[PDB]
Structure 1
Amino acid sequence: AVLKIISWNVNGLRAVHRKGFLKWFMEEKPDILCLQEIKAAPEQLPRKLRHVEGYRSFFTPAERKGYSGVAMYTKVPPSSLREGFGVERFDTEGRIQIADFDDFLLYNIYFPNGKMSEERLKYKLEFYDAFLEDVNRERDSGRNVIICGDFNTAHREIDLARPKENSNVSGFLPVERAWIDKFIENGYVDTFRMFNSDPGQYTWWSYRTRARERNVGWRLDYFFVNEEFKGKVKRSWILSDVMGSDHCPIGLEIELLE
C-alpha cells in the first residue's frame, strides 16, 4: 500500500470551491490532502466543503477571520494534531497543522509571506527558526517527518523564472534561501529534487500578466522528508495543470510499512 499526499495553497477554500475543487479532489483521491490559505471560518463553510465523503477534515484557522488558515482532509484520522510549535505568536495565524500518523508526523504549514514589510520578514524568518526547532526535536525523538506546504521561498535559481530581478525581493532573499540550505543540512530532503532536476518547475504564478501562461512562476510549495525516511518516497511531483488557485497542487507518494 502507498499513501498519496497532496498539498495545495488554494487561495481561499470558498474561492477554489467555485473553480472545480471538489471535482479535482474526487478525481485525484489522495489519502491526505493538506491545504493552505483556507481564509474561512470553519463554521462558515457549507457542509459539502468541510465534509467530503470518505475523509475526516481538520481545520486550523487564524485568530483573524478570513485570513490564512490551513486544513487537512485525511481518509484515516491522525492519532492527534498539534496546531502550533508551542510559541504563541507563530500559533495564532492558522499556519500550522502537525498531524501524528502511524509511519510519520505530517507538518502542513503555511509559511508566512515576508513581502509586506521588514516586520513580516523578520516574522517569516523567526517562524522558520521555530519550525526548524520543532521538526528537529520530533525527528530527534525518532519520528519520521513529512513537511509540506507553502514555504513562500524559492530555494535556488532554478526554482523561479527571474532569480536576478528578485534577489532583494522576499521570496528570493539570500537570507531566506540560506535558511532552506540550513534546513536541508539538518537532514531534510526537498523531495521534488530527488526525482526532477529540471528548470521551469514552479507551483506559484502571479494571477497577473499571463504569468501562468508564460510560466513566470516560483516553486514555493514543497514536500520535505527527513533523510532517514527518504527511502520511503516513491514520487514527488507538481500538479502543474490543476487550476483554481494562483498555486498549483504538489504531490507526494510514499510507501507504508506493512
Structure 2
Amino acid sequence: MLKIISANVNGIRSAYKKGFYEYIAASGADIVCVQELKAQEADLSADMKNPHGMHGHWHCAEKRGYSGVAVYSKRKPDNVQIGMGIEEFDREGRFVRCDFGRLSVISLYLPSGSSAEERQQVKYRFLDAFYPMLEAMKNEGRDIVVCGDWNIAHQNIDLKNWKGNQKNSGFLPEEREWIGKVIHKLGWTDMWRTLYPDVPGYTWWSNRGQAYAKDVGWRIDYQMVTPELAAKAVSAHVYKDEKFSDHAPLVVEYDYAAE
C-alpha cells in the first residue's frame, strides 16, 4: 500500500535526537510530511534533507528556529510547489506541494492562535486565503492528500476537554465551522474520522508529562483527501510506540499507486 505519514516534529533537530530518523525508515512510509522544522536550510543536515536517500523538498521560515515544512518521498516528484504565493504566510514556511503523476501530497503547518490576538487574526486570515486554494485543488480532479497540523479540533470527540476549550484557539466556533465547511461544503474527506467514526484519535498533547499521561489530547493533525483516493484508504493509526514530539505521527495506508 502507499503509506503516507504526517508528523509535526516540534523541531526536526530535536525529533532526530528522539529516534525520528530511524522511524522514517522503520515505518515503511512512502511519503513523510513534516511540520515545524524549527530550522532554516543552513541548519539542516544531509539526513534532514534526504533522509535514507529520499527526495526532500522544504519551505523554511525567514525567522530563526521557527516553523518550516517538508515533504520526503521515496520517488522523485515530477513537480514541486514551494509556498502558496502569499508573501505574508510564505515568509513563515507553511506549505509544500509535491506531485507524482496525478497524485499530489501537501505538507501544511497552519498558524496557531493561542499566543496572542494578533496571531489568532493571522490564523483567521490564513483560513480565508487557504479555503479558495482547497476549493481549487478539489476541482483539479486529481488525487490529493493535504497532510499536516491544522491547529483546529473539529467536534467534541476530537479533544479531551471540549467543555473547557470553547473560547480557546483550536476549538473556537468559527474555527470548527471552517473545518466543517472544508469537509461538507468543499467535499474533502477527514480521513481519520471517516475511517474510524467513533475513535477520538488525538494527535497532540501539550507536554510529555502529565498532559500526555492523563491523555489531555487534541486531534489537530489531519489527512484531508479527495473523494476517489479517500475510497482507497484501507487503514490508519496514530503512532505512539515511541515519542518524538508533542504530536504523534498520523499514518494512513492507501490502496493506490501513481503508475
TM-score, normalised to structure 2's length?
0.94
Distance in structure 1 (CA, Å) of the matches to 2:169 and 2:53? 39
- Aligned residue number for residue 98 of structure 2: 99
1:197 aligns with 2:197: yes
User: What is the DSSP-based 3-state SS (H/G/I as helix, E as strand, rest coil) of the residue aligned with 1:166?
Assistant: coil
Contact 2:95–2:108 (CA<8 Å) still a contact in 1?
yes
Contact 1:205–1:215 (CA<8 Å) still a contact in 2?
yes
User: Structure 1 stretches of 5 or more lacking a match?
Assistant: none
- Aligned residue number for residue 242 of structure 1: 242
User: What is the DSSP-based 3-state SS (H/G/I as helix, E as strand, rest coil) of the residue aligned with 2:92?
Assistant: coil
What is the deviation of 1:229? 2.7
Deviations 1:161-210 (A, max 9, x none): 00011010001101100000011121011000122123442000011651
Contact 2:37–2:68 (CA<8 Å) still a contact in 1?
yes
User: What is the DSSP-based 3-state SS (H/G/I as helix, E as strand, rest coil) of the residue aligned with 1:212?
Assistant: helix
Moved more, 190-199 or 108-117: 190-199
Deviations 1:77-124 (A, max 9, x none): 211221222222122211001111223221210011011122211211
Contact 1:154–1:172 (CA<8 Å) still a contact in 2?
yes
Distance in structure 1 (CA, Å) of the matches to 2:247 and 2:126? 21
- Aligned residue number for residue 144 of structure 1: 143
**Correspondences of 1:145-224 after superposition (within 5 Å):** 145-185=144-184, 186-207=186-207, 209-224=209-224
Moved more, 44-53 or 34-43: 44-53
Query: Which residue identity does 2:37 align to in structure 1?
Result: I
RMSD of Structure 2 on Structure 1 (CA): 1.6
Distance in structure 1 (CA, Å) of the matches to 2:103 and 2:208? 38
Query: Which residue identity does 1:168 align to in structure 2?
Result: K
Contact 2:71–2:106 (CA<8 Å) still a contact in 1?
no
- Aligned residue number for residue 61 of structure 1: 60
TM-score, normalised to structure 1's length?
0.94
User: What is the DSSP-based 3-state SS (H/G/I as helix, E as strand, rest coil) of the residue aligned with 1:165?
Assistant: coil
Distance in structure 2 (CA, Å) of the matches to 1:51 and 1:97? 15
Distance in structure 2 (CA, Å) of the matches to 1:195 and 1:23? 28
Distance in structure 2 (CA, Å) of the matches to 1:136 and 1:242? 36
User: What is the DSSP-based 3-state SS (H/G/I as helix, E as strand, rest coil) of the residue aligned with 2:147?
Assistant: strand
User: What is the DSSP-based 3-state SS (H/G/I as helix, E as strand, rest coil) of the residue aligned with 1:30?
Assistant: coil
The runs of 4+ residues in structure 1 deviating greater than 4 Å are none
Aligned residues: 257
User: What is the DSSP-based 3-state SS (H/G/I as helix, E as strand, rest coil) of the residue aligned with 1:97?
Assistant: strand
Deviations 1:214-258 (A, max 9, x none): 111100100011224321222232113330200000012112245
Distance in structure 2 (CA, Å) of the matches to 1:100 and 1:14? 27
Contact 2:11–2:36 (CA<8 Å) still a contact in 1?
yes
